[PDB]
């Protein structure tokens, strides 16, 4: 639950494979795992769509960060085929992926670098940075100027 709370680090599910196996083995708590897997297809949908749900949710978390993870290399570190990643993109087209940028030659995707209207984006960022430096610079300047008065 702590790993699924926030800041989901890119880790291998193989460490969780034995965790789910012993989750089916131990009976002191969370015993009805065989009842979760009672149906022959419902449990397969919950497992496949569960690993799909986390392998897409981590994409939804890293989508906020503009670090350009270069998912072409991430597919190599995760040891999976690119076809099911294209199917994951087929889940993104309904998951509101309209704010993205792809490339024809390479396979690197871009979740940032828009047309960048200078009247809205650069204006907003320059407002927060410049004004934040103005009032923030105004606070500690006279605040420190009042803090140095106690030495007299």
């Amino acid at each position: 639950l702590l790993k699924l709370f926030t800041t989901m680090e890119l880790m291998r599910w193989s460490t969780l494979v034995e965790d789910y196996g012993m989750e089916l083995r131990k009976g002191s708590l969370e015993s009805p795992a065989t009842d979760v897997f009672g149906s022959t297809e419902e449990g397969e949908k919950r497992w496949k769509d569960l690993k799909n749900r986390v392998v897409e949710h981590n994409i939804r978390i890293m989508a906020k960060y503009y670090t350009r993870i270069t998912m072409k290399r991430m597919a190599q570190l995760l040891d999976l085929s690119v076809d099911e990643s294209e199917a994951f993109l087929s889940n993104l087209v309904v998951n509101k992926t309209i704010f993205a940028k792809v490339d024809r030659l390479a396979g690197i995707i871009n979740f940032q670098r828009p047309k960048d209207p200078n009247n809205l984006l650069n204006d907003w960022s320059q407002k927060l940075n410049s004004l934040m430096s103005l009032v923030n610079k105004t606070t500690h300047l006279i605040a420190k100027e009042e803090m140095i008065h106690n030495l007299q």
């Binding site: 993109l89 993104l92 087209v93 992926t97 309209i98 993205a100 940028k101 792809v102 490339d103 024809r104």
Partner: peptide
């Protein structure tokens, strides 16, 4: 407008 819209530049 379904498949081209999410693809800015694709094959």
């Amino acid at each position: 407008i379904r498949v081209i819209e999410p693809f800015s530049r694709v094959q």
